[PDB]
Design a protein around this motif. Structure first.
Motif, PDB file in Angstrom:
ATOM      1  N   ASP A  34     -11.768   7.387  -0.129  1.00  0.00           N
ATOM      2  CA  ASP A  34     -11.193   6.639  -1.233  1.00  0.00           C
ATOM      3  C   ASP A  34      -9.712   6.951  -1.380  1.00  0.00           C
ATOM      4  OD1 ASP A  34     -11.169   4.869  -3.321  1.00  0.00           O
ATOM      5  OD2 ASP A  34     -11.830   6.335  -4.806  1.00  0.00           O
ATOM      6  N   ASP A  35      -8.923   5.908  -1.592  1.00  0.00           N
ATOM      7  CA  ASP A  35      -7.499   6.042  -1.883  1.00  0.00           C
ATOM      8  C   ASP A  35      -7.249   5.546  -3.297  1.00  0.00           C
ATOM      9  OD1 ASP A  35      -4.839   6.559  -1.652  1.00  0.00           O
ATOM     10  OD2 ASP A  35      -4.546   5.403   0.186  1.00  0.00           O
ATOM     11  N   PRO A  36      -6.969   6.420  -4.265  1.00  0.00           N
ATOM     12  CA  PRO A  36      -6.859   5.953  -5.655  1.00  0.00           C
ATOM     13  C   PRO A  36      -5.759   4.934  -5.884  1.00  0.00           C
ATOM     14  CG  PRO A  36      -6.186   8.254  -5.443  1.00  0.00           C
ATOM     15  CD  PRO A  36      -6.847   7.882  -4.167  1.00  0.00           C
ATOM     16  N   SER A  37      -4.818   4.780  -4.952  1.00  0.00           N
ATOM     17  CA  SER A  37      -3.705   3.861  -5.150  1.00  0.00           C
ATOM     18  C   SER A  37      -4.022   2.428  -4.745  1.00  0.00           C
ATOM     19  CB  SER A  37      -2.483   4.350  -4.370  1.00  0.00           C
ATOM     20  OG  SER A  37      -2.727   4.327  -2.975  1.00  0.00           O
ATOM     21  N   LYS A  38      -5.144   2.181  -4.104  1.00  0.00           N
ATOM     22  CA  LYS A  38      -5.472   0.818  -3.707  1.00  0.00           C
ATOM     23  C   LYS A  38      -6.278   0.118  -4.798  1.00  0.00           C
ATOM     24  CE  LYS A  38      -3.826   1.686   0.372  1.00  0.00           C
ATOM     25  NZ  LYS A  38      -2.643   1.907  -0.504  1.00  0.00           N
ATOM     26  N   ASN A 185     -14.369   1.684  -3.547  1.00  0.00           N
ATOM     27  CA  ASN A 185     -13.095   2.348  -3.338  1.00  0.00           C
ATOM     28  C   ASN A 185     -12.010   1.643  -4.141  1.00  0.00           C
ATOM     29  OD1 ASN A 185     -14.108   4.295  -1.668  1.00  0.00           O
ATOM     30  ND2 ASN A 185     -13.203   3.498   0.212  1.00  0.00           N
ATOM     31  N   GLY A 187      -9.110   2.146  -7.459  1.00  0.00           N
ATOM     32  CA  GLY A 187      -8.396   2.842  -8.510  1.00  0.00           C
ATOM     33  C   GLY A 187      -9.119   4.052  -9.059  1.00  0.00           C
ATOM     34  N   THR A 188      -8.799   4.437 -10.292  1.00  0.00           N
ATOM     35  CA  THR A 188      -9.446   5.584 -10.906  1.00  0.00           C
ATOM     36  C   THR A 188     -10.946   5.336 -11.036  1.00  0.00           C
ATOM     37  OG1 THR A 188      -9.039   4.735 -13.132  1.00  0.00           O
ATOM     38  CG2 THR A 188      -7.367   6.169 -12.174  1.00  0.00           C
ATOM     39  N   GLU A 191     -11.512   2.714 -13.656  1.00  0.00           N
ATOM     40  CA  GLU A 191     -11.257   1.368 -13.159  1.00  0.00           C
ATOM     41  C   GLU A 191     -12.368   0.895 -12.234  1.00  0.00           C
ATOM     42  OE1 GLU A 191      -7.398   1.701 -11.446  1.00  0.00           O
ATOM     43  OE2 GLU A 191      -6.407   1.864 -13.393  1.00  0.00           O
TER      44      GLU A 191
END
Ligand SMILES: [Mg+2]
Ligand SMILES: [Mg+2]
Ligand SMILES: [Mg+2]
Ligand SMILES: [Mg+2]
Ligand SMILES: [Mg+2]
Ligand SMILES: [Mg+2]
Ligand SMILES: [Mg+2]
Ligand SMILES: [Mg+2]
Ligand SMILES: [Mg+2]
Ligand SMILES: [Mg+2]
Ligand SMILES: [Mg+2]
Ligand SMILES: [Mg+2]
Lengths: 394, 107, 131, 63
Positions: A34-38, A185, A187-188, A191
């Motif tokens: 997971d990439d929290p910025s996507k 996958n 955001g937070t 979200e």
RNA sequence: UGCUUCUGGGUCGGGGUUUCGUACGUAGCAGAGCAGCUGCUGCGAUCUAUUGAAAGUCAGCCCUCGACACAAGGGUUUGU
RNA sequence: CCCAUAUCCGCAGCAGGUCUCCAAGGUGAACAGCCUCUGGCAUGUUGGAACAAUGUAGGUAAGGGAAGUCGGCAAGCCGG
């Protein structure tokens, strides 16, 4: 003493044991990190292997022998009608690994999904989720769900959605849907839950998960082949014709010492029906399913910019042993595991795709829709009738 | 309506597909007898000797593809017999098999 | 720059192919293949465009009893091209060359595969037709 | 990609179908399938094979 | 994997696809010839038309919703 | 009466052994092989359902053509 001439061993010990898979639907062993910025997005999908065909495209590969030239490439057609989200499952990271924390299910669950909860639908009373569903209708129950949703925000680190397939839209005998967790996958964690909660009981088309020219992984169970000998199971050398007691064998299954047969020696047993994960299968096309627009059935999803004939992806006589593809489909390059009708898990890549082959943009010039039930030679029935002319049937 | 008669076409071709030469005609009889039980639900199935002669008319392996039969559910006059009813399978010679439906026969 | 693609190999070691040049040789007996690393029990094999080591079995007495570098130009085993075309020839043929790839003769009889013509410019210029 | 025609039957071959044949005399032929190829290589004349385009044209079957 | 949402699968039928290659009969002033009778009638491999005809085609091919029946069942177990 | 894939000898209703007489049509050089009549039999001390591996016995195989192996063993080509 040492063996006279060197030679690589037959087979990979990394795919042991060569046994029948315990699961029929391919399991996603690792979701993308997971990439929290996507933005919030889904990472997998379920489709059914319809069949194979070939296409004509022009390659764009500078410095290659096929640069600016047309090539014929085989492709696998995977039917991907939209899935339905029915539940959310949250996970907590523990020093013993992720632990299932909480599961919430939607108020309404279609009978296709409920069939998954029974071994005999014919004999059952269909009582599944008959008392759970009441939690969504009364104030005490509702106040307990938002607390469950609030708890999943405080503690859970991984969020997944329980999506299931829509078997009523497929041409298959099966009516029991395939239900799978899909990791959310993006955001937070908060979200992820707002996004997942809003989509309960909603439909997620394949286009919202995967895109054109994307490299994906197919996970499934290979075609079973039953009991096989070492010659076919492991591809060892056949012994000379003079061999007494059979030549489809391995002649020496070990040395005197260690006084045991080792796990690394080819033996007979089950072949096929193995769980397998294959990576970097490019998406050549996300074809749209049939639509009825203004009283007309629009089905020319096999047309290209260079071929305007109104034909569907289905070939003459239909996909052999499968049926007719009338929903959305994903055109994958090459071959994938499984039989026809096999459920295939589509998963987003775990790797960074920075390679000319991986970044290449696909532009189809032609899709072969001739009959596969024989040596078909007509792309359409209109083309066949115009060539043959009238027949005695007419 | 225990005593009923219907006319059927039995696609023997798909019933005996893949069977060995020396077992092909015998298995046609077994499939005809299995077919009759399914359609009439009577374990006591009797196959007319003329239907037997039709299934063997071409030898043990080149069995006819289709065959038009007639099933009659009758009352078993044998009070000793545990089966009240039984099905009789007779043979219907036909020139063509095209467009032949399952037909109720009224006696 | 652009490199050739894999094609089916139709000519293992021991294959006797025609000699399609005017050197004098009538046929070429393939004793090995360039670039073959190989593995246990597997014969080295050749396809159109591959240089091989050959001996002349029928031909002029001066060309016999020695090993020549040859290049395969036709093969009877059909091979797929990237346009999906499966092509094969009526016979297996080759031409004698030197290590530099230059023909020992001056004329070729019959067509030449496009796979070999691209790879060997000196052979290509002598080819009457390209298939 | 352009569409060839079977050198025996006269049917058109779409990309990825049939085989191409190159004779030692320099002539090159295309075949729709091994049935057409087999008839051509056994030196059968397509004008006597009922299902070929040359036959139907010769006997004016379509016309 | 399926086993009543006027719905389900099944059987047969039909259609599609596909394989082989042009069915029996009938007609022919097409047929190398031959025989008999005064041009006709017979025997004749093969040829042409009917006729891309006939035949097969899911038994593990695709679609029917035409016909027919069947389907609301049976047995053994399991309790914090 | 049996006179022999069960009445004889091989421990047995044992694929072995054991002396003779008569001898149809077709194809064909033919008491060859293949099919049939007279006469005889019921598949050889069991059946049913499947169609995995490994076998035993038969086949086929693109391109190459002995490179396999101690050795062309085996099969194959030739055949009237
Ligand atoms: Mg060593
Ligand atoms: Mg031995
Ligand atoms: Mg096919
Ligand atoms: Mg070796
Ligand atoms: Mg037997
Ligand atoms: Mg018996
Ligand atoms: Mg006995
Ligand atoms: Mg071979
Ligand atoms: Mg060959
Ligand atoms: Mg040697
Ligand atoms: Mg050696
Ligand atoms: Mg020998």
């Amino acid at each position: 003493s040492h063996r006279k001439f060197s030679a690589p061993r037959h087979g990979s010990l990394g795919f042991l044991p060569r046994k029948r898979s315990s699961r029929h639907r391919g399991k996603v062993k690792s979701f993308p990190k997971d990439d929290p910025s996507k933005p919030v997005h889904l990472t997998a999908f379920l489709g059914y292997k319809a069949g194979m065909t070939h296409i004509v495209r022009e390659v764009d590969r500078p410095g290659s022998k096929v640069n600016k030239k047309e090539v014929v490439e085989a492709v696998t057609i995977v039917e991907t009608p939209p899935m339905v989200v029915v539940g959310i499952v949250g996970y907590v990271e523990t020093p013993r690994g992720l632990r299932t924390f909480k599961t919430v299910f939607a108020e309404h669950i279609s009978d296709e999904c409920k069939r998954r909860f029974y071994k005999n639908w014919h004999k059952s009373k269909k009582k599944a989720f008959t008392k759970y569903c009441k939690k969504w209708q009364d104030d005490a129950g509702k106040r307990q769900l938002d607390k469950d949703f609030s708890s999943m925000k405080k503690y859970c680190q991984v969020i997944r959605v329980l999506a299931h397939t829509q078997m009523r839209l497929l041409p298959l005998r099966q009516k029991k849907a395939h239900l799978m967790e899909i990791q959310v996958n993006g955001g937070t964690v908060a979200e992820k839950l707002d996004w997942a909660r809003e989509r309960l009981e909603q439909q997620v088309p394949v286009s919202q998960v995967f895109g054109q020219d994307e490299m994906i992984d197919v996970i499934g169970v290979t075609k079973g082949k039953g009991y096989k000998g070492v010659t076919s199971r492991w591809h060892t050398k056949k012994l000379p014709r003079k061999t007494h007691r059979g030549l489809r064998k391995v002649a020496c299954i070990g040395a005197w010492h260690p006084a045991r047969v080792a796990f690394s020696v080819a033996r007979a047993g089950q072949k096929g029906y193995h769980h397998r994960t294959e990576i970097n299968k490019k998406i050549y096309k996300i074809g749209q399913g049939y639509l009825i627009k203004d009283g007309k059935l629009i089905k020319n999803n096999a047309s290209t910019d260079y071929d305007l004939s109104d034909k569907s992806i289905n070939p003459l006589g239909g996909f052999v042993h499968y049926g007719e593809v009338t929903n959305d489909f994903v055109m994958l390059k090459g071959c994938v595991v499984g039989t026809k009708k096999r459920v295939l898990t589509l998963r987003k890549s775990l790797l960074v795709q920075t390679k000319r082959r991986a970044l290449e943009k696909i532009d189809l010039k032609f899709i072969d829709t001739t009959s596969k039930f024989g040596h078909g030679r007509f792309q359409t029935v209109e083309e066949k009738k115009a060539f043959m002319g009238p027949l005695k049937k007419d | 309506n225990e005593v009923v008669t219907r006319e059927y076409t039995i696609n023997i071709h798909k019933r005996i597909h893949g069977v060995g030469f020396k077992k092909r005609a015998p298995r046609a009889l077994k499939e005809i007898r299995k077919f009759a039980m399914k359609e009439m639900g009577t374990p006591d199935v009797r196959i007319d000797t003329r239907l037997n002669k039709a299934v063997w008319a071409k030898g043990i392996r080149n069995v006819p593809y289709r065959i038009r039969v007639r099933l009659s559910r009758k009352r078993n006059e044998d009070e000793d017999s545990p089966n009240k009813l039984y099905t009789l399978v007779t043979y219907v010679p036909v020139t063509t098999f095209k467009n032949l439906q399952t037909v109720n026969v009224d006696e | 720059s652009g490199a050739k693609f894999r094609i089916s190999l139709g000519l293992p070691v021991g294959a006797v192919i025609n000699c399609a040049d005017n050197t004098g040789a009538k046929n070429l007996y393939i004793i090995s293949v360039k670039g073959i690393k190989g593995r246990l029990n597997r014969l080295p094999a050749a396809g159109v465009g591959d240089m091989v080591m050959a001996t002349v079995k029928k031909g002029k007495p001066e060309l016999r009893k020695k090993v020549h570098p040859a290049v395969v130009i036709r093969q009877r085993k059909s091979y797929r091209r990237k346009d999906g075309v499966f092509l094969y020839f009526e016979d297996n043929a080759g031409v004698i060359v030197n290590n530099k790839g230059e023909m020992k003769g001056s004329a070729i009889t019959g067509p030449v595969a496009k796979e070999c013509a691209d790879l060997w410019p000196r052979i290509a210029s002598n080819a009457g037709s390209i298939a | 990609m352009k569409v060839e025609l079977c050198s025996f039957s006269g049917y058109k071959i779409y990309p990825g179908h049939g085989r191409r044949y190159a004779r030692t005399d320099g002539k090159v032929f295309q075949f729709l399938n091994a049935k057409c190829e087999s008839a051509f290589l056994s030196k059968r004349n397509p004008r006597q094979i009922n299902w070929t385009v040359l036959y139907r044209r010769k006997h004016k079957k379509g016309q």
